[PDB]
Amino acid sequence: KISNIFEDVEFCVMSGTDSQPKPDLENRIAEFGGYIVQNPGPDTYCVIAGSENIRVKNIILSNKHDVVKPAWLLECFKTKSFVPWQPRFMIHMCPSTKEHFAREYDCYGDSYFIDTDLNQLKEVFSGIKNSNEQTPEEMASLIADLEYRYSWDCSPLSMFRRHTVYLDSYAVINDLSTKNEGTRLAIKALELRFHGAKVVSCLAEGVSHVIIGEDHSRVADFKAFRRTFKRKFKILKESWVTDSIDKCELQEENQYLI
Amino acid sequence: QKENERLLRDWNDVQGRFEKCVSAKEALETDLYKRFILVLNEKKTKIR
Incomplete structure (x- = not known):
């Protein structure tokens, strides 16, 4: 609606208490017409999981849905636009999501095409193992x-x-x-x-x-x-x-x- | 006691401080170089 790009994508908003209680986030996504669902359907490319649940564990087991930290979606909303998937909000990748992150990024948060700064360098290095x-x-x-x-x-x-x-x-x-x-x-x-x-x-x-x-x-x-x-x-x-x-x-x- | 011990203890303290700064620089250098090498090898595999 307000951000109609946020529509058209199924959203398993079952744990939306990432920073604010889930109903707040559900209202936000509705304001952008996002296709909110309580349980992940097939096209649930974003399973809103602000808190771990046994059902979240099941969706982890079901390697078919994209379990995410909703902080990325908060960032998208603040930008009023879909931020591209970045490999740090992501809890349980789809195999498509696994290869997606492996493509648009290297084995770390750094991409293969988008240039990074020293801030992103430190972020990735922290994401990288302790290479000492x-x-x-x-x-x-x-x-x-x-x-x-x-x-x-x-x-x-x-x-x-x-x-x-x-x-x-x-x-x-x-x-x-x-x-x-x-x-x-x-x-x-x-x-x-x-x-x-x-x-x-x-x-x-x-x-x-x-x-x-x-x-x-x-x-x-x-x-x-x-x-x-x-x-x-x-x-x-x-x-x-x-x-x-x-x-x-x-x-x-x-x-x-x- | 006063001058000699204060100077000996200051010398030892700053010597250990230099040891610590050298070792910390070496360790953070290990992190930086090895992580950068990992990323660079990813880039080089992609390039190849």
Whole structure:
């Protein structure tokens, strides 16, 4: 009527107490001539379920009717126009509705054609599982890979995913029994971890860049392990790793040599 | 006691704060990158 587009579609308004009592919603749909039904008929492409019921459980069992959160229909009414089906009000899809959402959206709320913003990005990601289960180290590889191919490595805030950089928190290296306490060396290692660096406090072949500890006389052992381990480790003072995330500026990897 | 202990405790507190911010950034980065990768793989399967 008022919104005659809301007519012509059967509406199982049996639980319309989504936000307001069901009779309010029934009156609203009538004002738009919507085809309200107490029980879902065949063309009930919207089963108004503002509250779970045993009958709602049955309609869930009956994979023929579209059990919905009526908040979407509230949005449609506020727009005075049918909002397209969005895969978050939907309780029990029809198989047609399942493939419908799988078509006009991906496996999440995001579509395949309609562009989304950071708000919709956060909404989808919350809809997506907690994807922190993936090793942040493998995520580092992903980042490194993506940050290079997408040129997202331009962000200095996470740059050492590319870098296999060592850091010295020990007075002498290749001796795990030694450690500097009450120092910034551990803080610098945390800076490395902020960029997703391969944070290592012992020199091996995998080491590529070496951040010196507070004592800069260790560069002798640094070069000794640069020659025992075939990689020429890039000698780095504190300022390198500090400005990597404090100043957010990568320092020269050769200016600190010895 | 006064100066040395206040500075040691402030240093430890802010060091732990830096640890927490690094770890939280890494974890939220894991969520963001992996969820975006899931969506991007959906898009790439659709594109293919």
